[PDB]
Write a protein that binds this ligand. Structure first.
Ligand SMILES: [Mg+2]
Length: 339
């Protein structure tokens, strides 16, 4: 089986590849078990130029007992269709993948042009909730190759409560350890073995200061970088406890948690939660340049606000001509190997 040309062609990758730059939109929303009240265009259609791939991740899609015991959800449909109508107006998109575990759902959309360059798609889900196993929390993920560059997108809902930052670090360490994709037809890939890893969702890290009155006022006074020195995730990374070697963008939007449903008002409950930057987008990999990192106050469907981030990501895209010239060179040299 002298099909080693294929093997050779692989290892001469450099000679027929460019690093082309592509637009990835990534969004994350905790919908608090609600159906869409509104359009999603402010969230997804806020960039002049259209994205090339949309990575949208939801948490708490369905807070019912039925969803909690793995039964089908009407909300899965409701929110998929809601996103489809909300994508950019300057490019037709198609659905690459959907993955739900209870209320955690990741949708990948792709510009119609580019879908044919999406291969080897696999998906995992890992419940780290009740008894360390249940799907009330944990994470769902999708992986794939896009051209000759490997991606793996993780959507997570990590443990709640300000005190439990150590458990969130544990929920992270569990996902990394447990999640294992099985494609193509032998070796099982884990999350970190990919070329670009985008990690988003309700990571649930809170501000490491109790006094809620300070926080509300500091936020009110525009000074957010004082607040951000006490953000648990910022610390957990700094002290190398969790999310290394991940990057995050400068963060200039007011805390996305927690609001009074249907309003831009801070939580009025008797608990009276301290506001938090629960909803985050981190990444790992080269040729990744972030352009934006923002939230969308104008969507009042949930008690969380949606967060978005536009990325420029370099992808190794095959040049057909260089590929052919190389292929022809290789076979010519092979054929020439006749004693
Ligand atoms: Mg809830």
């Amino acid at each position: 089986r002298e099909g080693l040309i294929k093997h050779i062609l692989a290892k001469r990758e450099k000679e027929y590849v460019n690093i082309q730059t592509f637009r990835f939109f990534v969004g994350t929303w905790n919908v608090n078990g609600q159906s869409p009240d509104s359009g999603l265009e402010p969230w997804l259609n806020c960039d002049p130029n259209p994205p090339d791939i949309y990575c949208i991740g939801f948490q708490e899609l369905d807070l019912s007992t039925e969803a909690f015991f793995y039964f089908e959800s009407v909300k899965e449909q409701e929110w998929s269709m809601a996103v489809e109508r909300g994508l950019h107006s300057k490019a037709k998109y198609k659905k690459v993948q959907l993955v739900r575990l209870v209320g955690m759902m990741l949708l990948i959309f792709a510009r119609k042009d580019q879908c044919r360059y999406i291969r080897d798609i696999a998906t995992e889900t890992v419940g780290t909730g009740i008894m360390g196993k249940m799907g009330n929390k944990g994470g769902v993920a999708v992986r794939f190759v896009f051209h000759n560059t490997t991606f793996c997108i993780v959507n997570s809902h990590l443990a709640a409560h300000v005190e439990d930052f150590e458990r969130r670090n544990q929920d992270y360490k569990d996902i990394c350890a447990r999640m294992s994709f099985v494609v193509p037809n032998l070796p099982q890939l884990n999350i970190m073995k990919h070329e670009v890893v985008i990690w988003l969702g309700d990571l649930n890290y809170r501000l490491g200061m109790p006094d809620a009155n300070e926080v509300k006022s500091l936020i009110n006074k525009k000074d957010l970088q004082r607040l951000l020195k006490f953000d648990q995730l910022n610390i957990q990374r700094t002290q190398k406890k969790a999310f290394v070697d991940f990057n995050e963008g400068e963060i200039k939007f007011i805390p996305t948690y927690k609001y009074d449903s249907k309003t831009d008002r801070w939580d009025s409950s008797g608990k009276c939660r301290v506001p938090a930057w629960c909803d985050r987008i981190l990444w790992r990999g080269t040729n990744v340049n972030q352009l934006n990192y923002r939230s969308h106050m104008e969507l009042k469907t949930s008690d969380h606000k949606p967060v978005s981030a536009l990325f420029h990501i370099g992808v190794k895209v095959v040049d057909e001509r260089r590929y052919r010239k190389v292929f022809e060179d290789s076979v010519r040299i092979m054929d020439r190997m006749e004693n």
